[PDB]
């Protein structure tokens, strides 16, 4: 597992001595090939896992999120390549430190073969996200939406610590590999039902849950681009990685205590997905739309059943990809119009062609068209649930009808109708955001075509 | 700016505790969740009292 | 073909009628057919054998990987983890294995229900009873343990239904 | 050998070969309609031998060609059912786009993305020919989503016209109103009958309940425009008139009825979605007259 | 494990003679590496905090830094594992010289084990 | 031109070191867990004429 | 370029500040009318009119032409509910009781 | 790295669970035992606890 | 107005950031507010002295 992580930690002495021009070239290529090299993962077996030494392991739940998370890095920095321009060259380096070090410790904590480990490298990815938005964000609401995006998570997580220190003076071992070969069933009884709590919460904070997702569209809205990609493509599978990997030895206890949850999530979906029919701010609606997608993942992972963890793995991948995708197209339209409002910026098809087919093709992949590896996700987690129970696929259809009507609804606010008369600053799209579309859009229908390899360990 | 402030950002600084906000809070808060509630745990012991009694005929049921 | 075994594929002898031209009008069929013969088959063919003699000259074998048995998970101590391990191991390419059976007798019936046309219903009783089989067997081995499963949870399984099975035999033969 | 499955197989690949040269020099030409035209008129005169293979023996055929994934007990393949019904609509289809291309040629001569329009035509065929000629539920419902994500774009042809968007989005509306109920057939087949393969669904099914055949129901009312959901039918008009002439009039909107017609084997078998389909249809044709005998505009009379 | 009465203990010894039985660390010892990068820096910070040229201002003052630190930190592992050693030996010690408080188990085979099947539905 | 380009690229050369840095440090660390080697109830061989580990 | 005073605030008691937020909102005290004062977070916002934006004259040159807007008129509350894409209540030739009952 | 990733190994057994399967229904098509048992381990191997209630 | 306004603006918002954060600040309030007279310090610190030999015996 090294070979992947000693090249991200050379990222960093190779950024600082960097020329002053030459901070991005070197970044993004280096970048690529770290991706090409984790592209190696992939190749999993049958059999129990790819267990490298005592301290790191890979699995084919593990490697798409390892791949996915060593591919947004380039992205991320093609996408803050321009906002950063008028920016000294010890800030940039900065930046990119930061982005580094949050793509080394996400490597890091995908792997963690031990459960204290993993909570200390989950808990370390919270400080170059909280300096990324509260020092580079645009608007004086950022410092709030940190505090936010801070405690929350906090509140959730420490709780879990106390929980898995118990667990280690009973059990005696925190071990993925003896904790899954040993597990024993849980007796209905208060403190193994606030156990089941601690063990729960830390991570359905962090997907969000309904009930706890206010910090999401703030921390989204005010963070920079490469903020907000890395929020809403790979920080938000952290909790539903936590939930497939710790699930095993809260079993029988699910049964009963997953019942308020899936309430929460199934109307959840069907009230974001709503919220985000009136909505003037889009990047707002993006953020209610990663909401409602991570609820559906949320209820995959409460039923607890193969296809639901196959789904659930399916849905996080397509949607990191297309909710990043979603936030560079209105970070495209912002940076020439510096508004951030739907409704002001119109007709823009007419202008930027070429764009409004990136537009369309993420709103179609956002909607679940098939055979676009989203629909595999959703039908899967929905054939799950309605096996669950029948009454399940009233709400589905209901919230697949409003994602389909809120996705069609920002595609035809911003690029259809007559332009607006006195916005006159638009200027012909560059090549490096044609390139960051193509690239963040041909790994989605690349995959469609080989889905088994974003299916999970239950293939 | 004025709409979209007024829309966001006004909304919780002129919010008042008022009879007709907790109860309007209150339903759309927590009737939904507590009607689904009842219903899929009534939907989910009909099914488990039937595959008790055996009388269910699940034949071919094998991906779940 | 040779490429897969007919017994695990069965098919019928494939009786097909004889021509029976019962006009002197000459039908579009055969001579559309000896056209498409002409100009598609044959350099199809050709260009088939130039890749089959290509491959002929570079001949090269793989081979199946085969397995030994190992203790189950009956034979494992509480907390004996090596003997577990090997136990979950081979209980996993059984599963696996069984998937593949499923499968197998599935594409025989599927197999049936296209060919026999449209009496399906009777001439393809024999695969539907096989399938109802292999189907029951499977789902009282798997059907319930979910995701996290294990070869504890099917040993557990499997010994809750022969209680249950060992007390109605008695209360049977008590009664 | 059998030229039945090359010829039913070369005639929807052959309608693909103008959408990959639309990155071409010639999509940056004015020979593009008339390559697509001529493209299609192939397309129908070499689909027209498979159907008199049919005609002269009864020719049917299964091609499962490509693997796709495959979870646990259940095989999903890229797989071809060539009975009847598709051998006999493949050739109407593609007689009828043909004719349309060659008025639009004429149509829209006018219209500065004529090759884009010529392209979205193609598109829609050629996801109308997966619908028609799916085996599984899964490739189904891809051609069910193609058609009507093509329709929506073909509605809103002139974007910057309030109404045609409106149209579109009404259209999107109803459909997934439909595609509700198309899932839920979906689902519960995976459930109980293990598959979502055409022959394992037959043959699973002696006396098939009441919820997929009213899953289906409800997809074929939501994508025929029945009375349930039928303002989206009248409202397409918003498009040029090919678009009317081909999609919304006599290829797209039979899908929900071809899909009941696919699925005749276990409608036969239940007595009350029967009757709920009749009722559906008769009050559908009536209120539908009803409403046609009274207007003015001439293609709200048609549609 | 309050080890500070543990009996023949010398007081302000940091590492006993009975320590030198044990392998020393390797000079190649991935904790050394640590605490040598933690001395680089501390020299980094310092050229730092002076407003020098961070890399490139002091390389004897970098150099003693990181010197110093491989120095404490080979002595520290050396005490660290030293008593660790020392738990790990009272704790054997203590289950042999008591077999009343830890009794073998009975080797039990899960085939003759009854645990309670709960399904996932 | 050598010797004037190195000062400027020699930052290029990092991560593929720290790549085969990394490949010699997993094959390092796989030297340490070699206790089962050969002796898999699954893949107990008999060594062959000139072969000393199953796998390094 | 908008300063603190351009921006919505409470509910406005007194004539005076009545007054100043009608001035904000560009538009007559007379014509001005908050919403009630209720728990809702209105606040100081002007309440329009509820009719929709396809009812607005279509030969009038708006600045806006699709929207049917003008540059610095107040905004309705629900703009984005009525946007000639989305519900609309113009006027009918049949009374919407009569159609109610005929269609029910 | 697709071209990678399209022609990887098959570690996950996928044909050589296909292969083991037609051998062992070979095999019990021919003996006439009754496909796949129902019980995953052998009975004789379970030492059941006897209830005596 | 219920969805988006009434509970995901107003009431999630009230109950679980803004209600801590009033508590936290009115304890906060309480605690640090001492005038700074050693009079009232001793006096709570003789009351804290009693009470642990009343209490923790
Ligand atoms: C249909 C079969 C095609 C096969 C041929 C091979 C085609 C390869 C294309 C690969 C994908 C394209 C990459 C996406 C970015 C777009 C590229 C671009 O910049 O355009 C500039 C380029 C030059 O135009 P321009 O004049 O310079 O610019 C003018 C403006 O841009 C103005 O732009 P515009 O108005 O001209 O819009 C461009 C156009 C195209 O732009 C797009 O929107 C592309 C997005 C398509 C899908 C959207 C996501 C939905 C999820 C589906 C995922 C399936 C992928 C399969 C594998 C993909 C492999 C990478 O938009 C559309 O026409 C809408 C398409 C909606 C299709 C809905 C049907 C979905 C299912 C279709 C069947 C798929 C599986 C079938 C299995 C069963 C049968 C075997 O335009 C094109 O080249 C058009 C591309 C051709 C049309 C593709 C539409 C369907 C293809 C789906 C994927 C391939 C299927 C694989 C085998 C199926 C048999
Ligand atoms: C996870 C484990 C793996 C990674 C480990 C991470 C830690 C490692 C490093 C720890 C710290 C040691 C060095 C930091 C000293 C600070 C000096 C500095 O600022 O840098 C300037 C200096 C360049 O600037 P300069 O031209 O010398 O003069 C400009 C002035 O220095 C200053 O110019 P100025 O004053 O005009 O600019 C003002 C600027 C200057 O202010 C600063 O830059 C302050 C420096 C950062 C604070 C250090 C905190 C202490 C360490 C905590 C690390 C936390 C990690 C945990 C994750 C949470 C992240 C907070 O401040 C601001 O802009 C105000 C706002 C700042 C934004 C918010 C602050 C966030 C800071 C958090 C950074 C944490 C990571 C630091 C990484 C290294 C950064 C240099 O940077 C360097 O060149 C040194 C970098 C390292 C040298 C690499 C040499 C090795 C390569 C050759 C051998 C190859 C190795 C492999 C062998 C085999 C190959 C064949
Ligand atoms: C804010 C947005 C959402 C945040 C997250 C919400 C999700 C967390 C909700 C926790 C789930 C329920 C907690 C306990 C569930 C146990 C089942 C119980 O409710 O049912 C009955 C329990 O009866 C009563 O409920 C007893 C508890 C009553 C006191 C609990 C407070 C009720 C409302 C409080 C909700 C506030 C949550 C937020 C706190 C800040 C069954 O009766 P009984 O057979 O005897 O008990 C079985 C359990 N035994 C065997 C261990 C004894
Ligand atoms: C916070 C980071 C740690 C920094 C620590 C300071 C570093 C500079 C210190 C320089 C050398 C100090 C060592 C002293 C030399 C001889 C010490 C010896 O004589 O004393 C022995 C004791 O040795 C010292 O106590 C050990 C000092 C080592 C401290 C390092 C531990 C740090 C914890 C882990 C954090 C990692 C830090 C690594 C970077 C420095 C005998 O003690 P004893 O009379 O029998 O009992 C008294 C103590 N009792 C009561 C608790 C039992
Ligand atoms: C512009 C208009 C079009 C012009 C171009 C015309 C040509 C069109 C052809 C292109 C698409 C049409 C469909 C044709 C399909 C042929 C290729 C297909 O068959 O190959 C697939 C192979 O594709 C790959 O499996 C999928 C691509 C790999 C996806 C990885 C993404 C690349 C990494 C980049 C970073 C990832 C970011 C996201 C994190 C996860 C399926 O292979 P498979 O049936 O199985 O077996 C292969 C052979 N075996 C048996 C020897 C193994
Ligand atoms: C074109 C230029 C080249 C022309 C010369 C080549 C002519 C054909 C000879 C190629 C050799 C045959 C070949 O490609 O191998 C078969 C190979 C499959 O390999 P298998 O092992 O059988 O199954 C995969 C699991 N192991 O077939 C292929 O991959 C090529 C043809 C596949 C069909 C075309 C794909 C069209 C659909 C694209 C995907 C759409 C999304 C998925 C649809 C979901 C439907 C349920
Ligand atoms: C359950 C269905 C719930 C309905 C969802 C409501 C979603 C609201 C948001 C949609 C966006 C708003 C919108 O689309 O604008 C309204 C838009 C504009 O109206 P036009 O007449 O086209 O005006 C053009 C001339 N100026 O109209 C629409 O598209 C909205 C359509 C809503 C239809 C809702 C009614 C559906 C009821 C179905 C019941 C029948 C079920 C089928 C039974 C058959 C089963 C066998
Ligand atoms: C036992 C005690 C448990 C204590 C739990 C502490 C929770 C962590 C948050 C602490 C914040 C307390 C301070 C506070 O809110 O003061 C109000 C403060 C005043 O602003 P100032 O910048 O300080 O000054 C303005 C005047 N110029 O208001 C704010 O700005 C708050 C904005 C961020 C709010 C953070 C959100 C915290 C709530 C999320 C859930 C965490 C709660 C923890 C327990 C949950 C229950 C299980
Ligand atoms: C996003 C913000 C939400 C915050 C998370 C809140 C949920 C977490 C649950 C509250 C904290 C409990 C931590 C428990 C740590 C696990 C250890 C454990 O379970 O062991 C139990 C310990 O169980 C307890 O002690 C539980 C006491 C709880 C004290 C603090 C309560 C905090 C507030 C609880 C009310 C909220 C409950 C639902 C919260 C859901 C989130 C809103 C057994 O104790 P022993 O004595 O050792 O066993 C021997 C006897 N059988």
Not at chain 1, 327 to 341: G, I, K, M, P, Q
Not at chain 4, 35 to 64: C, D, N, R
Not at chain 9, 16 to 30: E, N
Request: contains cysteine; glycine residues 4%; charged residues 15%.
């Amino acid at each position: 597992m090294l070979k992947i992580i000693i090249p991200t930690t050379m990222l960093l002495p190779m950024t600082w001595m960097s020329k002053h021009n030459m901070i991005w070239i070197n970044a993004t290529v280096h970048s690529l090939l770290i991706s090409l090299i984790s592209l190696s993962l992939l190749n999993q077996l049958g059999e129990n896992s790819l267990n490298f030494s005592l301290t790191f392991f890979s699995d084919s739940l593990s490697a798409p999120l390892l791949v996915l998370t060593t591919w947004l890095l380039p992205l991320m920095l093609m996408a803050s390549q321009s906002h950063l321009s008028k920016e000294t060259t010890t800030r940039k380096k900065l930046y990119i430190t930061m982005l580094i070090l949050l793509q080394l410790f996400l490597i890091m904590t995908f792997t963690a073969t031990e459960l204290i480990l993993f909570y200390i490298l989950f808990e370390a990815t919270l400080v170059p996200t909280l300096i990324i938005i509260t020092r580079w964000g645009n608007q004086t609401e950022r410092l709030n939406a940190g505090l936010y995006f801070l405690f929350y998570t906090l509140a959730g997580s420490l709780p879990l610590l106390v929980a898995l220190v118990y667990i280690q003076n009973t059990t005696g071992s925190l071990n993925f590999l003896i904790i899954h070969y040993w597990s024993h069933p849980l007796s209905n009884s208060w403190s193994n039902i606030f156990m089941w709590l601690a063990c729960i919460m830390a991570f359905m904070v962090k997907m969000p849950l309904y009930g706890l997702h206010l910090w999401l569209p703030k921390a989204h809205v005010e963070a920079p681009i490469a903020g907000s990609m890395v929020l809403a493509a790979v920080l938000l599978k952290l909790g539903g990685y936590g939930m497939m990997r710790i699930t095993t030895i809260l079993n029988p206890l699910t049964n009963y205590m997953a019942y308020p949850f899936l309430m929460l999530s199934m109307w959840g979906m069907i009230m974001t997905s709503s919220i985000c029919l009136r909505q003037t701010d889009l990047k707002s609606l993006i953020a209610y739309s990663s909401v409602s997608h991570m609820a559906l993942v949320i209820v995959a992972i409460m039923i607890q059943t193969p296809w639901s963890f196959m789904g659930a793995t399916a849905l996080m991948i397509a949607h990191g990809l297309t909710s990043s995708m979603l936030f560079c197209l209105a970070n495209t339209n912002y940076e020439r119009v510096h508004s951030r409002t739907m409704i002001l910026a119109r007709g823009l098809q007419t202008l930027l062609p070429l764009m409004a087919t990136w537009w369309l093709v993420a709103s179609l992949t956002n909607l679940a068209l098939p055979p676009s590896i989203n629909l595999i996700g959703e039908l899967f987690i929905i054939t799950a649930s309605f096996s669950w129970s029948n009454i399940t696929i009233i709400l589905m259809g209901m919230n697949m009808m409003i994602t389909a009507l809120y996705s069609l609804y920002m595609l035809i606010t911003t690029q259809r109708g007559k332009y607006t008369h006195h916005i006159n600053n638009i200027k012909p799209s560059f090549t490096r955001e044609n390139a960051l579309m193509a690239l963040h859009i041909l790994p989605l229908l690349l995959l469609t075509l080989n889905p088994k390899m974003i299916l999970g360990p239950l293939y | 700016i004025r709409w979209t402030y007024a829309r966001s950002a006004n909304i919780y600084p002129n919010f008042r505790p008022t009879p007709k906000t907790s109860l309007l809070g209150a339903l759309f808060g927590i009737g939904p969740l507590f009607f689904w509630y009842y219903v899929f745990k009534t939907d989910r012991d009909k099914k488990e009292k039937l595959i008790q009694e055996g009388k269910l005929d699940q034949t071919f049921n094998i991906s779940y | 073909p040779d490429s897969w075994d007919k017994d695990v594929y069965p098919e019928p002898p494939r009786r097909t009628p004889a021509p029976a031209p019962q006009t002197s009008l000459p039908n579009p069929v055969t001579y559309l057919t000896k056209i498409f013969d002409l100009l598609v088959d044959r350099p199809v063919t050709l260009a088939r054998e130039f890749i089959e003699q290509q491959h002929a000259k570079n001949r090269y074998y793989y081979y199946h990987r085969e397995f030994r048995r190992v203790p189950d998970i009956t034979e494992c101590e509480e907390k004996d983890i090596l003997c577990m391990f090997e136990a979950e191991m081979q209980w996993r390419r059984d599963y696996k294995v069984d998937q593949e059976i499923v499968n197998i007798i599935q594409e025989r019936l599927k197999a049936c229900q296209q060919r026999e046309g449209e009496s399906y219903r009777q001439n393809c009783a024999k695969e539907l009873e096989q399938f109802t089989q292999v189907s029951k067997a499977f789902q009282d081995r798997y059907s319930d343990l979910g995701a996290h499963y294990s070869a504890r949870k099917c040993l557990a399984k499997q010994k809750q239904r022969m209680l249950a099975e060992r007390k109605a035999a008695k209360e049977a033969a008590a009664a | 050998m059998n030229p039945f499955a090359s010829l039913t197989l070369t005639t929807l690949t052959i309608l693909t070969i103008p959408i990959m040269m639309s990155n071409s020099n010639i999509y940056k030409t004015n020979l593009y309609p008339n390559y697509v035209k001529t493209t299609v008129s192939y397309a129908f005169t070499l689909s027209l031998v498979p159907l008199l293979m049919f005609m002269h023996t009864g020719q049917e055929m299964i091609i499962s060609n490509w693997h796709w994934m495959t979870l646990q007990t259940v095989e999903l393949s890229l797989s071809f059912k060539m009975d009847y019904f598709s051998v006999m609509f493949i050739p109407v289809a593609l007689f009828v786009t043909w004719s349309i291309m060659e008025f639009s040629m004429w149509y829209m001569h006018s219209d500065p993305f004529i090759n884009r329009f010529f392209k979205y035509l193609l598109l829609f065929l050629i996801t109308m020919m997966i619908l028609v000629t799916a085996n599984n539920l899964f490739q189904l419902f891809i051609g069910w989503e193609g058609v009507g994500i093509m329709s929506f774009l073909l509605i809103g042809w002139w974007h910057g016209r309030t109404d045609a968007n409106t149209a579109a989005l009404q259209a999107i509306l109803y459909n997934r109103i439909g595609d509700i109920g198309f899932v839920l057939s979906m689902a519960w087949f995976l459930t109980h009958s293990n598959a979502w393969d055409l022959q394992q669904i037959f043959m699973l099914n002696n006396e098939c309940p009441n919820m997929p055949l009213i899953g289906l129901l409800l997809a074929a009312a939501g994508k025929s425009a029945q009375f349930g959901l039928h303002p989206w039918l009248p409202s397409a008009m918003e498009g040029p008139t090919p678009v009317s002439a081909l999609l919304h009039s006599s290829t797209m909107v039979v899908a929900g009825v071809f899909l009941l017609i696919r699925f005749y084997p276990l409608m036969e078998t239940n007595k009350l979605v029967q009757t709920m389909t009749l009722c559906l249809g008769a009050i559908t044709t009536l209120f539908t007259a009803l409403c046609a005998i009274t207007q003015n505009d001439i293609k709200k009379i048609v549609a | 494990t309050m080890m500070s009465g543990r009996p023949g203990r010398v007081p302000l010894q940091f590492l006993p003679n009975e320590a030198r039985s044990l392998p020393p660390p390797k000079l190649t010892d991935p904790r050394l590496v640590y605490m040598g990068f933690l001395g680089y820096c501390s020299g980094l910070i310092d050229n730092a905090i002076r407003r020098r040229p961070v890399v490139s201002a002091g390389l004897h003052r970098q150099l003693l830094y990181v010197t110093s630190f491989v120095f404490f930190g080979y002595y520290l592992l050396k005490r660290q594992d030293y008593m660790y050693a020392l738990r790990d030996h009272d704790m054997f010690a203590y289950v042999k010289s008591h077999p009343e408080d830890f009794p073998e188990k009975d080797k039990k085979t899960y085939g003759e084990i009854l645990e309670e099947f709960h399904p996932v539905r | 031109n050598v010797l004037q380009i190195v000062r400027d690229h020699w930052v290029h050369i990092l991560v593929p070191v720290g790549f085969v840095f990394g490949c010699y440090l997993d094959r390092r660390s796989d030297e340490k867990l070699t206790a089962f080697r050969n002796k898999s109830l699954l893949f107990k061989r008999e060594l062959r004429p000139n072969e000393e580990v199953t796998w390094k | 370029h908008v300063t603190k005073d351009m921006f919505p605030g409470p509910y406005p008691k007194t004539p005076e500040e009545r007054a100043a937020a009608a001035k904000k909102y560009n538009m007559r005290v007379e014509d001005y009318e908050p919403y009630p004062d209720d728990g809702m977070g209105y606040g100081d916002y002007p309440k329009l009119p509820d009719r929709s934006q396809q009812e607005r004259d279509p030969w009038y040159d708006w600045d806006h032409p699709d929207l049917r807007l003008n540059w610095g008129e107040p905004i309705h509350w629900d703009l984005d509910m009525y946007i000639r894409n989305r519900v609309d209540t113009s006027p009918t030739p049949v009374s919407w009781n009569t159609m109610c009952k005929h269609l029910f | 790295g697709s071209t990678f990733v399209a022609y990887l190994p098959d570690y996950r057994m996928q044909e050589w669970a296909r292969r083991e399967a037609e051998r062992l229904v070979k095999y019990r098509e021919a003996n006439g035992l009754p496909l796949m048992e129902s019980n995953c381990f052998d009975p004789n191997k379970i030492q059941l606890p006897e209830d005596e209630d | 107005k219920s969805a988006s306004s009434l509970l995901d603006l107003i009431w999630l918002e009230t109950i679980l950031p803004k209600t801590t954060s009033f508590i936290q600040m009115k304890m906060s309030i309480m605690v640090s507010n001492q005038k700074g007279l050693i009079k009232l310090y001793f006096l709570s610190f003789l009351i804290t002295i009693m009470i642990s030999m009343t209490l923790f015996n």
